[PDB]
Structures are given as structure tokens and as C-alpha cells.
Design a protein around this ligand. Structure first.
Ligand SMILES: OC[C@H]1O[C@H](O[C@H]2O[C@H](CO)[C@@H](O)[C@H](O)[C@H]2O)[C@H](O)[C@@H](O)[C@@H]1O
Lengths: 284, 384, 443, 272, 384
């Protein structure tokens, strides 16, 4: 037909125009801006340097340390989140007592603000004040070290952001008819042999969408490191590096170059997860 | 092999399958039949170890098995919703139990091929269970069950999700298969057509208490209860109350002089004074086509045919006589599903009657096998 | 009902370390202007390089609600060369310069003018001191080696063993290292900040390696603070307040902090709330604000516990050269009305309100006519040391790129527990030089 | 039985403790008196309310709550309207390239904030729009539309449009039918999608931290991230925990009240 | 009221309702029965105005209607999936086509109460159709369909989603209900049982084109096609191939020379070369019980019964043959769904036959109800 299709275009034009006029124009601007020597203190002289604002970022120490830190946090946090969220989903889906209290307890760390969660984890791991650092040996302070500080950031991120992954995995899992498990149980599989040959290959799209969401949302963390470590000890992730280089040095050429490079990193991740491993849309 | 059980029960936090006992022989085809709500699906599950039996024995072979998980007994249940994995291929479905049972993969291929050759899905061993029709879907289910050569092959109303036409062919196919393989089988069902078509015995349950074990012929032509006389219905039985003439029985629209034999079987075993007579729809005919019985040696009457259906070699003639037929042991639950309305009677006349919807009729009843009953106990009085 | 219209309000930005002693001054001067205008008081973070972040984020992205700002002493060059912080010779009247140059101390005032003309009028002149508990140790260290010796002696005895020095990846550590580098003889940048001179000459090389050795002796002494690599101006104050430390080097605003925290509970080695004479001293809003007799009785009982002393030198017979702190009031270049803003920066640094700020806010005063008042020399007891520590001072490089240098040479020393006296010197020279040239990424 | 019941009791208690122990640390720290906060006692002996009696004295944590609520409501209204107009066309209409629009939306819902804040801070949306409400409503809409599209498409595909035919069997008036048979069916899905969008557009820190200066247009996450303490010469742990607890509750109550809707909306209506 | 249509059609980017012509009067109860995917539901919609007429007229009593609205076309459909609004209450669900018709509230109350009293859901008038069961939900749907008292009343398989047993009760309900109200009806279904029970005429449709119109008896006992006689009569009437022997017809088990009467009646037209012969299962009577003159003229034969089934009033025996009898012009479309088994037939015998599986039976085929057709065009030769 043509009437209904023209009406579809008329109904879709608002959202599409809005989204790619306030998501693609910022990136076109950031590119045109990274091609320049644009300091925010003296903006009267911004000459055009071809690509010496990407070389300066890609051949500098502070860029690769931040990239390594954010990749480490991403992979470790996403793995622990997947495991623990599969556990939470199987508990919220197959429990005999009140499964309303459990959904409530799981929605509490989903609606809370990341800033308050990070303050809780910051005061918990401070010696003297915190109960979680008052049980370590004497004179430890596991928040002024690099690797322990990173472990604590991973723990904060896992706690805060596992319930959303759990709910997505449950959205996938509640589409497993009980009959299938009853048949696998008659077949002689057992509790673990079926979790790997009946229920896991069934929720492949839910697992893949949850992994994509988690990987990107962990690649774009700013506050669990802002108000918990601050970026000291060479801990700050790539978002904190962009924030620092834009607002503490005023160089917006380098700030927008870092913006473009982060966008390309996220694009490569979300292209791997899509062209490889499948992971189509949930509305497919 | 040969599955035995006795004294078995269940308890939900209630007597669900209380007081159950039988010895299903090697090849004997038990049909656990009953109305939705009776303990058929749950006694099946119990046999399949999905719920540990509360009290009693569970002897596949001759030994206690009510402790071993379903992974051990080698039962190979089929399900009503065709539980078959979509993420697999038909051959991988069929070979799932066998690949879990540690079979050599060459023998895997050979045996799955023989199983798919027995059935008629032979070429479908590469598609997925999302591009299949109901017949071959349920056939894939049965094929997955066949392969193990199980010990008590037990089904769970597999033909419930199909249409109302392919079920005939599927009944024939299950019968032919079962007769070829030769394995013990128990078959939860929902109607009487299957329970009378495919079966060596029948177990008519009401809410948990078995009412009769017996071959379909003996379950039909000699019921042991009201429920097992009205549940094997076709045109369900017609439950007229009546009186004790002390020479015969006086119907609401007639009076019989039954016989001396049934008379002494009724009198020598005295009972309270309430007798609900039953006359199956086959025996009722139009007096205009017969002379032997319909005369003085029968009970004729007249009624306006509220509706007549000439649906082939048999004209069903309904009629509604006034009075009462309620107030019995279990006819309340019997009529909860069928025979709605306190008075709605059927008569099966031959395919050459002269009637239409809205004129009188002269119906007679062959007073030879009218099945009297009781009310204070419900038990039949013709035979056990 | 209050979109935007109304009487003039002049947003006055200060660090959060003075959100009460400057709200009190804004309140003392508001009611004096009568009906002309009012002086609000917005605040900035506590970090010394985070308030520059906020202030320049408001200045670059044009924020028409920024009128006066209290900027540090090392930002006048960068805030004047960049166009912000309009000079003092630009009024509808033209007398704020006459007001600024009039009475101030020369030390602080010379840190306001960038080339020859002023760009901000000073309001405060900080200077680090040595605070030590007086019932634990007599005869304070007076030398960093003696300081480390005293810490070790109190650790072997089993008391407060910390040192509570501001070692953290921020401007406070560069202030510390600059004091220790100027005392020994070196200096970060040349006279004109054109070339790095940390490790230029073996004299300067020896000075910087000695400063690094002293930075590493602390923070690796046995019994030292477990978290000394994440402490700052505040946590050292509270460290000595809560009894954990027994020595500390910190700005002179710690005496009223200790007095208030004692008289409202707080410390345990100094009750001051069992005294029935201190009741009703604590102000209603929270500050101390004592009488004369109540301050005498809250100081007589704090003179036998918590004496102070001048900053410990780097050699036995060479006095220390501490660095300048302070605040300079400058009127932003994104204010629609800057005659009233100059009147505000002219009536926030009156002689009165300077007595107030200095006496009961800690922050020293820049007016030379105060240090000779017999009541002031009695209510501000650390007027002595501060004075005799502004003669030989150590002003930071004061160049238009200084914050880049001070954010490279504070990340070359990022965890102070593990530095290398001889390797970190060359790492520092390379870092500082690549900051002067302007090429790289800020950590 | 008793074994499985005991195991499930243990698992439920463990999940509840795991999910509540870092929220009852903020509270137990905000109720601890200043003279003894430096005690690792997870249970606050000798509580006192002198840390909440000093957070509201001065409209610094209330105006931020008002700004966050207003921004959330306005971006929720706009995102719901436009995403509904665009998610009714991907749940009922058949136009070419509709399995791509949902994918692109859900992909650019994971856009990183940093790559957006360097150009925005310079744009026309930084030329007289620095810290106002529109300057924050715009990027919040950027990040909130795809959630609205996804949730409302989940909430539309399930309603039976054969009911519209059943309605048009009586009068056939399409306006009255679509108003009295289709609107009261869809409305709760729209309200749940709005709840979810408002919750998701309430906790962002980077954009509201880089594009907000004055007392107007400064959300709550930024007001607490910049919080230093009530008094200037006393330890700020109790005061910062008090501020965090003040900011957290107005959304914890939300999620607790609307839990049955949220769980079913996030799961595309799978669980009920 | 009086719905007359002719030459209606349809087109799909396909003439789905090509050559449809009928004239339904008042009170009649027309069925539109056909196999799956046929032109039954589409002609129903086309009558209702949901799919416009591609070519033809639809004069529903008053004038041409094919260019009118649903509010004045044939009113009061009742869909299969019971399209009923869940947010409303049963009261509002029933009253919707009334309240939408601006009838005052007191009269609404009275009319909806009496309509819910026609059925048995009056005490359920306050619930919401999310807490209701299939039976009462169907009752709500038909009750909404009733209140209007419209001109004609067109149903769409309302008894397809119900359970296995309630269908017969709801069938009797529909019959009595249309007998009371008296509205012109069309009723689309998928089976011959209902289409014969509740019906005044029958429209068997295959690929869109009608096959035979008329009384259910006129369709069962006088078919004019292979498809009609292989569709009606649920046990598909047996099929055998043969050719004419110039005196009768010949089978591998019987040599049928019926009569010179039907001989000349077949010779009154052109004699085809390929003839197909059909016998109903109900005309095979087991000579062991055929004590009469029909014993000689029975053309009896013998075969081992593969499977017998005594489901009550009649024993159904199965048996197989040899050769090739899969010649089909409509039998292929028939067996696409049901009718599996190239050589597989079934015979009904009285319940006094002592025959079982494994032995020979003398199946008597009394050649008096024989129906023979042409293998080419399937048209009937004996009757019209
Ligand atoms: O006296 C209280 C002040 O302490 C800090 O001020 C110092 O901060 C930097 C060192 O961390 C120095 O550069 C600065 O010159 C000092 O004044 C604090 O930052 C200020 O807010 C206080 O007023």
C-alpha cells in the first residue's frame, strides 16, 4: 500500500528528525572541532591543523592507561554481572516464598542514584569510619592503592547495575515453558546439565542484548570513579580523561578528539557484538 | 516392563489420588480416564517421579522406586503441549535422550534413522520445530519418546492440541505403533472416544477415587456405578427416577414388568427405597418401525420432538419430560459438564424415521437392559 | 513569583572552606549598602584546583550570573592574559585601584598585578605553620629531620605517630614541594617563566633531590599515615583534631577550628564543654563568635595542649621559605554591571570585616594597620609568625601557564609513598618542560 | 517439604541483605552523632537528627530536587509523546525499514555522554543556553526517546486490535471507537512507559554537571556531588550521608510504589 | 431479515469467493462449512462489510448494501476469539451496542438484564472478562450479539475454542436460542457434525466455489459430488476404483450387477472410462448377523480385521486392501487434511458381532445404498 506507508513516514519523521538532529550534529561538530587548534581561553586564533590532534591523543601515555583501565573494568564487571545476574534471575523466577519482596529488594538498587551508592561505597571502605575496611588488617586503607581502588569500583558497579541485567535476563527466561524443563528432566539431564543444553541456548538473544547493554553502559562510567577515586593513582577512566582535558586545560580540540575516539571505541564494540555473535534487536 | 502399584495416595496442603491399586502387565494399555479435576494427570506425574508419592509403593518391575529421580526409571513421557526444543533440529531433538544416554554416535545415527523411518517424518531430520505442522510436531514428540525402548512408555493426552479431524488418524497411528513396539503404556485422556478406542483396560476416576477397572466392553455393558454409566456417554445416559412396582418398575411415563431374575437379584439383596433407572439412548426406538417389543412387551409413550438431527445413519431425537431427576450421589458432578438442564433426554432412532422438529412421536424402549440404580449409595444394581 | 526581575544582587564566589566567615561578611556589608544592592554568596569546591575548574567553566561558557570572584594568588596571570577578571582601572569611577594599592601588605599585593597594572584586589594572605600537641612533645621539631625523629619516637612509645602533611594529587602537594624546594635553594621555573630549572645545575639538582628525599622520608616512615597519599588541607586538620596525629603543617585557620570543635564537643584531649563559662559562646548559626573573656578562657585551656610554631626549616641554620597563599577579589568579565561589583569588592575588604575575617575565620588579613592594634595582637595570636614568614617568602612561578606546570608536577609525584629521589628529578624536569612548551594531555 | 523451603528461605534472606546492606549504611551513618561517627558500628547507637535539621536550612537541596523533578517531568512528557507517535507506527504499521529503526534507537540509547559534552558545551546550545532548563531537556530527550520507543512498542504489540473491529461492528465510527475501546486499553502502558522514562532520566551526572552553574537548573545528583558539609569546621561524613539519604528517598519511594508496573514494563510484559 | 446475494467475488494480490449465489429467507439458519483455508470466513466477512465486494451485489433485505457501513449492514457478528473488551464489565460488554445506540439507562438496565436472563450469566453481570472462563465468555459474546435484535445474525466459529465436551451443550443452546429469537443466520464452521446438527441448509465450499446447497438430509443421502459425500459422514465413505463391465461393476472382492433400472439410468448419459465406487461404512452388516433375504444378494467378502473398536452402540472394524485406489479429483484435497491411508477402510457393525482382531469376517455389502461417481469430473450419475 501507499496510504499507510506514507502515514508511517509522517508518524516516524518527528522522532527520527529529532534523534539524528541532536545526536548526529553533535558528532559532526566534534569532528570539525577536533580538526582545529581551538583553545577556550583565547578563541580568536583557531587555525586548522589536519590531524595533529589525534596523533597527540593516540601517542600519549595518559590515553592508553585510561583505555586499559576502562577495558579492565568493563570485562570484569560485565562477567561478574552476567554470572550474578543469571543467579538473581533464576532466584526471582523459581522461588517458593514471596517473590514480591524479592522483586522489591532488587528494584531498590535499580532506582537509587549512582552518586548515593558511590558515597555509600566510599564511606564503607574508609578505615575507622567504614565497616568493610575495619575488618581488614591494621593499617591497610584499600582506597589509596590502584588495583584495590579498581576492585572497589568494580564492586560498586556490579552492585548498582546487576538488577537491570537480572531483569533483562528474566525477560528472556520467563519465555521458557515449564514443559521443556520437565522433558529435559525425564531425559536424565539433571539440574546443571539442562541449564547448559536447554535453557541457555534458548535465551541467546536476551543474553546478547544484556551483554551489549552492560558492555556499553560500563564503557561509559564516570561517577563511580569521580566521587570514589577521583582519577588519582592513574585510575580515572576515559570519560574522566575527557572531562579533565576539556575543563581543566580548556583545549577543546583535544577534548573533542577524545570524544570522537570514545565514540569510535563504542562503535567498534557494538559492531563486533552485532555483525559477529548475532545479537539482533529485541523487536525482531 | 510390567508396572505395578498399590495403596498409593497423594496429599496436597488433601486426598488427590488416594487409594489407587493395579498391576499393569507387560503390554497392557491402561487408560487413566476422568473429568478435568480428577487425579489422572497427577497420578501420571507421580508415576513419572515429578512428585514423590505420599504413601504406598511404586513398583516398576517389583521393587520400590518412589525415591529415584525421574532420570533413572526410563519412562519416556510424551507431553500434551509437545515439549520439544525450538533451538534444536528434529534429529537433535530425537537424539537428545540418546546422546545423554552415552550411545555410540554411529549407532546414534542408525537408531534415529530407524525411528524416523518407523514414523513418516524421515526427511524432516534437518528442519527446526518452528516450520512443522501439528501432525509431524506431535510425531517428532512420539519419536523422541520411542528411541529409548523405555520400560513404562507413558503418554499424557498427546492428541489434545490437534484439530478435531486428524485425531482419528492419530488414534489409529498410536494403536498401530503400540501394537508394533509392544511396551507397557499408560495414557491419560480427557474423553470417552479415545478411552474406548485404544485400550486394554480403563480406570474411570472421580476426584481421586477409582470407580471401575475394566475392559471397555465390560465398562460399557456392565457399569459398577452411576459415574461409570453416565461418563461413557456418546448420547449420555438418560436418568429417569421410578418406583418399585414389586412386579416390575413404573417409569414416569410407563410401567414395566421386568423379569423374575433381576427381581430376585434386587429383592434378595434388599436396599433403601430409591431407584434411579437408566436407559441408554441406543435402546429407544420409534414404535412405527418394529413390532416385536414395542407392543405390550415394552413401554411406549409420546412426546413432542423438541429437536431432531438426521446426521446420517442415525436420527437423534431430543425430548423434555417434566418431573425431576436430580438428588443423587454424584449426578450433580456428572451433569456439571454434560447433560445440562434437569430434563434433556436423547433417543437414537434408526435412519428411516418419519419425524421433523415440532411434531409428536411414539417412542418405545426395549425393556431388556434398563440399568436400575440407587440414590443413598449410587452403586449400580445390574452388575458390578 | 520571581523569574529574574528585582534589586541588584552581586553573586560573590568563595571556596567552601569559608562559606561561613564570608557569609558573615556579606551579611555585615549587605545592610550597610542600604537599598542600593545586595551581596549574595555562592561557593566553590574545597579543592584548590577544582574551584578554578568551576570558575573557568562559568567564565568561558558565558554565565551572566557571575559578578565577583575570590580567585587564588596563582590565577591572576592566567585570568588576566585570557581576558577575564577586568583590570582595576576600569570603573565608571576609577578608584578601586587607589583603594587596593592603598594599605595592603606588599607581599600579597605584588601577586595581583600581572604586568604592571592590578587585576585583583587582595583579601587574604595564608602562610603555613607548624601545629603540635604540647602535652606530648616539648620543644617542637624545628627541622624536618627532627620532625621525622619525633614521629618515630612517638611511634615506638605508642601514641599519635602521624605527620599529617598534605600529600595528594592536587595543588597542596605542589605547595609543599615548592616550600621544600625553595628552602633548599632551587626553584621550579626561572625568573621569567620561560625555561625549567629544577635540575639545571648540580646546585639546583641537589636542592630538588633533597626536597624529594624529604617528601619520601615522610609517607614511608614506620607508623605513618596509612592513607597519606589521599590526604589534604582538611583531613590533616581533622587528623590532629581527632588525636590521630601529633604534628601537622597547615594554614593558620586551624586554631579557631580546634577551638570551635572543642567547645562544641569534638575533640577529647580538650573538653572545653564541661566549662560552664563557655555556654552560649557558640553562635546560633554555628560559628564560634566568643566574647573577650570567653575567648580568653577558651584559649587559656588550649595554650597548654596545642601550641604552634614556625614552619620547620630544611637545614639546621637556614630558616624556611614558605609559599604565599591567599585570595584576590576580581570582578568577572561576564558581569553586566561592574561599578556596583567594584563597590562590593571595595566594601568587602574594609578594615572592619578584615578584623572579623582574620580573628574569627582564621584566614589572615592583608591590612597593615591591623597587626599594630593591641586588641588584634591579642585575639589573633599567630600574627607574629605570619609576619616574620612573609619577609622571606617563596612565591610560586606566577606565569600564565602555571596551572599546567602544577598539574604535571603533581602527577609526576602522584603516589608519594613510591617516588625515587634521583629518577623523579629528571621525570619532573621533562614533565615541567613539556608543560611549558604546551604539548601533551593533562592527567 | 522442609529442605527446599529452608534453602529458599536462606536464598531470599541472602538476596535481601545483599540488596539492602549499602542503603542501610547511608542511613546508619547519617543518624550517627558527630562525636562518634568514627566507629565502624553498622548499628547507630545514640542516634540524633542534627544532620537532617541542617540540610533543609537553606534552599540548596530543595531547589535541586525541584529542578530535577521539573526536568524529569518535561523530558518525560516530550519523550512519551514523540516516542508514542513513533512506536504506534512500529507496532501496527508495515513500512520498509522498521526492524532497523528500533535497532538504531536502542543503539543510540547507549551513546556515551562524554562524546556529547564537548561539542554541546560549544554549540548554539552554549550561546545563551548554558544553564537553563532547555539546555538540559534537549540531551535528556536525546537519551530518553529510545527507552520510550522500546517500552511503548512492547506495550502496543500486545493489545488486541481485533477489538477495534468488534467495536466498529457497533456504529463503526472510528473516532469514538478509537477513543472508547483503544484508549483505556493503552493508557496504563503509556503511564508505565512514562514512569520508566522519568526514572531513567533522573540519575544522569555528567551532562548536568557540565552544563549547570547557577541555583536554577542544577539537578540533584550534581547538588550532592558538589556537597561539602553543613558546617565548615566539623567532619562532613554524617552531613554528606544525610544529603545522600535526602536525595535518594524521593525515588526509592517511587520504585517501591510502582514495582508491579516497572517489573512488567522492563521485561516487555513477559513476567506479570 | 431476507439476505439475497449473487455473483459476489473477491480478489487477492485471486477469486476467493467466485460464483457464490444464494437467497436466505427469514428465520433460516444457514451454515457455511468447508475445509481449512477455504472461502468460508472470507464470504462471511464480505457479508459483514469487513472485506468489500470486488464484484457483485449484497442486497440485505432493503436495498443494495455493498457500499454501506457496518452500522447498517448485516449487524451483530460474534467472532471466534470472543472479541470482548476486558476493561469493561460484563454489564457494559453486553450493553455496548445498546448504550452506543443512545438508549436511555433504565431501558438499558431492563433489556440487558432480560438478555442476560436468556442465558445463565445474570449473576455474573459485575465481573470483568479477565476472570471469566471459556463457557461463560462465549455466553458473554453471544449475549452482546443478541441484544440488538438485528435483521440478520452472522456468527464466526464461536464453538471452536471451547473444550472437548461443552461444544454439544453450546450447540443445543444455539439451536434453542435461534429457535426462540428467530433471526436470519449464517454460521461458518469446520466440521460436518455441527453443520448437520444445527442447520437448515448447508453450503459446502472448496476453493471458494459452492458444491451443493440444501437440507442436510438432501446432502447426506443424495450427494452430487465426491467431495460432498467424502466430507459429510465423518467416517469417510469407502472408496474403490473400477471400470464398467458392460453389465455392472467389478471389484477384487465383489462383482456388482445391481439392477437394470440404475443400468439404464446410467446409460441415459455418456459412459466414462474411469468410474469410482463408494460405499458408506454404515452399509456393511456382517452376514453372520444378516438373517434374511439379503444374505444371498450381499456380495460378501472376507478379510482379517486389523483393529476393531467397541465404543458402544456399534463395533467399528478396520480393514485393508491391495492394488491402487488413489485416483482422485477432489479426494486429494479431501485427504490433504484427513483421510490418511491409501488402502484403509472402516465398517460399522451391530454390537452383537462376535468378531475380533486376527480372524476373518464376512462383511456383507448390501448393494442398495450404492453411490458411484466418475473419476474424471466426480459428478454423480445416480442422483442429483
Ligand atoms: O586558609 C584556608 C585556605 O586553605 C586552602 O588555601 C590554600 O590552597 C592551596 C594549597 O592547597 C594554595 O595554593 C592556596 O594558596 C592556599 O590558600 C584552601 O584552598 C582555601 O579555600 C582556604 O581559604
Amino acid at each position: 500500500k501507499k496510504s499507510e506507508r506514507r502515514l508511517a513516514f509522517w508518524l516516524i519523521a518527528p522522532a527520527v528528525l529529532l534523534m539524528l538532529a541532536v545526536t548526529a550534529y553533535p558528532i559532526g561538530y566534534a569532528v570539525w572541532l577536533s580538526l582545529q587548534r581551538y583553545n577556550l581561553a583565547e578563541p580568536h586564533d583557531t587555525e586548522f591543523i589536519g590531524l595533529a590532534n589525534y596523533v597527540t591523543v593516540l601517542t600519549d601515555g595518559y590515553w592508553w592507561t585510561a583505555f586499559a583501565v576502562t577495558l579492565g573494568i568493563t570485562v570484569v564487571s560485565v562477567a561478574i554481572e552476567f554470572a550474578l545476574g543469571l543467579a538473581l534471575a533464576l532466584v526471582m523466577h523459581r522461588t517458593i516464598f514471596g517473590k514480591g519482596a524479592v522483586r522489591t529488594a532488587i528494584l531498590i538498587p535499580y532506582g537509587i542514584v549512582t552518586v548515593a551508592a558511590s558515597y555509600s561505597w566510599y564511606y564503607a571502605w574508609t578505615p575507622g569510619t567504614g565497616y568493610l575496611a575495619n575488618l581488614l588488617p591494621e593499617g591497610s586503607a584499600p582506597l589509596t592503592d590502584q588495583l584495590p581502588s579498581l576492585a572497589i569500583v568494580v564492586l560498586a558497579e556490579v552492585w548498582k547495575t546487576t538488577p537491570f541485567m537480572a531483569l533483562l535476563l528474566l525477560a528472556g527466561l520467563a519465555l521458557v515453558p515449564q514443559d521443556l524443563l520437565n522433558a529435559a528432566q525425564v531425559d536424565g539431564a539433571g539440574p546443571w546439565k539442562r541449564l547448559t543444553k536447554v535453557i541457555l541456548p534458548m535465551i541467546k538473544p536476551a543474553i546478547l542484548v544484556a551483554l551489549l547493554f552492560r558492555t556499553l553502559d560500563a564503557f561509559r562510567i564516570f561517577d563511580n570513579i569521580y566521587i570514589l577515586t577521583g582519577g588519582s593513582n592513574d585510575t580515572g577512566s576515559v570519560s574522566i580523561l575527557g572531562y579533565d582535558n576539556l575543563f581543566k586545560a580548556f583545549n577543546v580540540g583535544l577534548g573533542s578528539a577524545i570524544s570522537v575516539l570514545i565514540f569510535l571505541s563504542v562503535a567498534i564494540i557494538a559492531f563486533i557484538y552485532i555483525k559477529i555473535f548475532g545479537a539482533a534487536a529485541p523487536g525482531s | 516392563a510390567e508396572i505395578v502399584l498399590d495403596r498409593v495416595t497423594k496429599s496436597y496442603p488433601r486426598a488427590a489420588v488416594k487409594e489407587f491399586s493395579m498391576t499393569i502387565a507387560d503390554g497392557e494399555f491402561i487408560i487413566l480416564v476422568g473429568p478435568s479435576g480428577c487425579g489422572k494427570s497427577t497420578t501420571l506425574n507421580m508415576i513419572a517421579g515429578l512428585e514423590e508419592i505420599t504413601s504406598g509403593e511404586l513398583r516398576i518391575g517389583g521393587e520400590r522406586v518412589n525415591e529415584k529421580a525421574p532420570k533413572d526409571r526410563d519412562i519416556a513421557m510424551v507431553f500434551q503441549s509437545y515439549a520439544l526444543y525450538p533451538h534444536m533440529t528434529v534429529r537433535q531433538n530425537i537424539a537428545f535422550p540418546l546422546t545423554l544416554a552415552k550411545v555410540p554416535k554411529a549407532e546414534i545415527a542408525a537408531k534415529v534413522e530407524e525411528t524416523a523411518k518407523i514414523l513418516d517424518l524421515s526427511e524432516l531430520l534437518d528442519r527446526k520445530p518452528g516450520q512443522l505442522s501439528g501432525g509431524q510436531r506431535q510425531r517428532v514428540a512420539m519419536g523422541r519418546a520411542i528411541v529409548r525402548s523405555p520400560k513404562a512408555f507413558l503418554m499424557d493426552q498427546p492428541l489434545s492440541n490437534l484439530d478435531a479431524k486428524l485425531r482419528v488418524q492419530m488414534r489409529a497411528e498410536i494403536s498401530r505403533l503400540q501394537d508394533r513396539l509392544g511396551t507397557t503404556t499408560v495414557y491419560v485422556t480427557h474423553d470417552q472416544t479415545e478411552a474406548m478406542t485404544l485400550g486394554d483396560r480403563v480406570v474411570v476416576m472421580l476426584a481421586g477415587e477409582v470407580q471401575q477397572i475394566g475392559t471397555p466392553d465390560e465398562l460399557y455393558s456392565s457399569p459398577a456405578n452411576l459415574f461409570v454409566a453416565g461418563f461413557i456417554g456418546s448420547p449420555a445416559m438418560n436418568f429417569f427416577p421410578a418406583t418399585r412396582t414389586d412386579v416390575g418398575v413404573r417409569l414416569p411415563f410407563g410401567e414395566v414388568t421386568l423379569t423374575p431374575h433381576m427381581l430376585d437379584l434386587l429383592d434378595k439383596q434388599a436396599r433403601p427405597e430409591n431407584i434411579i433407572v437408566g436407559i441408554r439412548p441406543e435402546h429407544i426406538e420409534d414404535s412405527a418401525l418394529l413390532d416385536g417389543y414395542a407392543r405390550i412387551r415394552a413401554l411406549t409413550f409420546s412426546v413432542r420432538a423438541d429437536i431432531v438431527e438426521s446426521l446420517g445413519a442415525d436420527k437423534y431425537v431430543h425430548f423434555t419430560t417434566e418431573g425431576a431427576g436430580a438428588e443423587s450421589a454424584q449426578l450433580a458432578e456428572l451433569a456439571a459438564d454434560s447433560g445440562a438442564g434437569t430434563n434433556q433426554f436423547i433417543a437414537r432412532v434408526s435412519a428411516d424415521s418419519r419425524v421433523r422438529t415440532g411434531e409428536q412421536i411414539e417412542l418405545a424402549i426395549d425393556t431388556t437392559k434398563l440399568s436400575i440404580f440407587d440414590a443413598a449409595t449410587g452403586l449400580n444394581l445390574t452388575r458390578d | 513569583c520571581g523569574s529574574q526581575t528585582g534589586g541588584i544582587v552581586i553573586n560573590y564566589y568563595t571556596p567552601a572552606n569559608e562559606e561561613a566567615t564570608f557569609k558573615a561578611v556579606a551579611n555585615r556589608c549587605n545592610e550597610q549598602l542600604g537599598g542600593r544592592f545586595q551581596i549574595a554568596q555562592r561557593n566553590l569546591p574545597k579543592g584548590a584546583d577544582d574551584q578554578r575548574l568551576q570558575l573557568a567553566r562559568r567564565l568561558t561558557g558565558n554565565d551572566k550570573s557571575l559578578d565577583v570572584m575570590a580567585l587564588d594568588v596563582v590565577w591572576t596571570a592566567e585570568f588576566a592574559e585570557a581576558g577575564w577578571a577586568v583590570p582595576l582601572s576600569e570603573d565608571p569611577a576609577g578608584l578601586a585601584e587607589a583603594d587596593a594599592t592603598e594599605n595592603t601588605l606588599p607581599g600579597p599585593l605584588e601577586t595581583a598585578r600581572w604586568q604592571d597594572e592590578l587585576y585583583a584586589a587582595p583579601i587574604t594572605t595564608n602562610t603555613q605553620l607548624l601545629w603540635y600537641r604540647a602535652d606530648l612533645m616539648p620543644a617542637p621539631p624545628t627541622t624536618w629531620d627532627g620532625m621525622l625523629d619525633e614521629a618515630n619516637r612517638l611511634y615506638r612509645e605508642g601514641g599519635p605517630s602521624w605527620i599529617a602533611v598534605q600529600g595528594k594529587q592536587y595543588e597542596g602537594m605542589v605547595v609543599w614541594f615548592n616550600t621544600l624546594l625553595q628552602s633548599a635553594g632551587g626553584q621550579v621555573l626561572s625568573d621569567d617563566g620561560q625555561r625549567v630549572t629544577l635540575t639545571d645545575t648540580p646546585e639546583h639538582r641537589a636542592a630538588t633531590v633533597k626536597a624529594l628525599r624529604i617528601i619520601k622520608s615522610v609517607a614511608t616512615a614506620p607508623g605513618a599515615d596509612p592513607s597519606i597519599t589521599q590526604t589534604d588541607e582538611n583531613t590533616a586538620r581533622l587528623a590532629l583534631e581527632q588525636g590521630k596525629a601529633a604534628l601537622e603543617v597547615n594554614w593558620p585557620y586551624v586554631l579557631p577550628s580546634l577551638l570551635e570543635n572543642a567547645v562544641k564537643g569534638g575533640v577529647s584531649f580538650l573538653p572545653l564543654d564541661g566549662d560552664p563559662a563557655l555556654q552560649g559562646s557558640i553562635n546560633d548559626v554555628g560559628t564560634f563568635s566568643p566574647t573577650d573573656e570567653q575567648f580568653d578562657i577558651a584559649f587559656d585551656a588550649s595554650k597548654k595542649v596545642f601550641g604552634f610554631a614556625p614552619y620547620p626549616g630544611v637545614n639546621p641554620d637556614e630558616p624556611a621559605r614558605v609559599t604565599l597563599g591567599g585570595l584576590n577579589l576580581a570582578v568577572a568579565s561576564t558581569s553586566q554591571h561592574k561599578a556596583e561589583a567594584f563597590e562590593a569588592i571595595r566594601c568587602l575588604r574594609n578594615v572592619e570585616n578584615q578584623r572579623y575575617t582574620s580573628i574569627e575565620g582564621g584566614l589572615p588579613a592583608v591590612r597593615t594597620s591591623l597587626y599594630d592594634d593591641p586588641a588584634f595582637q591579642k585575639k589573633y595570636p599567630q600574627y607574629e609568625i605570619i609576619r616574620q614568614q612573609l619577609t622571606n617568602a617563596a612565591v610560586r612561578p606566577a606565569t600564565p601557564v602555571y596551572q599546567a606546570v602544577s598539574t604535571r608536577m603533581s602527577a609526576t609525584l602522584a603516589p608519594i609513598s613510591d617516588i625515587d629521589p634521583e629518577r623523579t628529578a629528571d621525570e619532573l624536569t621533562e614533565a615541567v618542560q613539556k608543560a611549558i612548551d604546551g604539548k601533551g594531555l593533562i592527567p | 517439604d522442609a529442605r527446599r523451603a529452608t534453602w529458599w528461605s536462606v536464598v531470599n534472606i541472602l538476596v535481601i541483605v545483599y540488596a539492602l546492606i549499602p542503603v542501610l549504611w547511608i542511613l546508619s551513618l547519617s543518624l550517627k552523632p558527630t562525636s562518634s561517627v568514627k566507629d565502624g558500628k553498622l548499628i547507630p547507637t545514640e542516634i540524633t537528627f542534627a544532620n537532617y535539621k541542617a540540610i533543609f536550612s537553606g534552599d540548596a537541596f530543595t531547589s535541586a530536587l525541584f529542578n530535577s523533578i521539573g526536568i524529569g517531568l518535561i523530558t518525560t512528557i516530550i519523550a512519551v509523546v514523540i516516542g508514542g507517535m513513533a512506536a504506534y507506527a512500529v507496532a501496527r504499521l508495515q513500512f520498509p525499514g522498521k526492524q532497523l529503526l528500533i535497532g538504531v534507537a536502542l543503539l543510540i540509547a547507549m551513546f556515551p555522554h562524554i562524546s556529547l559534552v564537548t561539542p554541546i558545551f560549544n554549540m548554539w546550545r552554549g550561546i545563551g543556553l548554558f544553564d537553563t532548563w532547555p539546555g538540559l531537556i534537549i540531551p535528556y530527550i536525546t537519551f530518553a526517546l529510545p527507552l520510550a520507543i522500546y517500552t511503548l512498542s512492547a506495550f502496543f504489540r500486545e493489545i488486541p486490535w481485533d477489538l477495534e473491529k468488534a467495536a466498529k461492528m457497533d456504529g463503526a465510527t472510528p473516532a469514538q471507537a478509537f477513543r472508547k475501546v483503544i484508549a483505556p486499553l493503552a493508557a496504563p502502558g503509556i503511564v508505565t512507559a512514562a514512569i520508566l522514562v522519568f526514572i531513567f532520566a533522573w540519575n544522569d551526572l555528567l551532562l548536568a554537571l557540565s552544563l549547570t552553574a547557577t541555583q536554577r537548573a542544577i539537578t540533584a545528583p550534581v547538588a550532592i556531588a558538589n556537597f561539602t558539609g553543613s558546617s565548615q569546621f566539623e567532619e562532613p561524613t554524617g552531613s554528606i550521608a544525610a544529603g545522600a539519604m535526602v536525595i535518594t528517598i524521593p525515588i526509592i519511594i517511587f520504585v517501591l510504589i510502582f514495582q508491579r508496573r516497572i517489573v512488567a514494563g522492563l521485561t516487555s510484559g513477559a513476567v506479570k
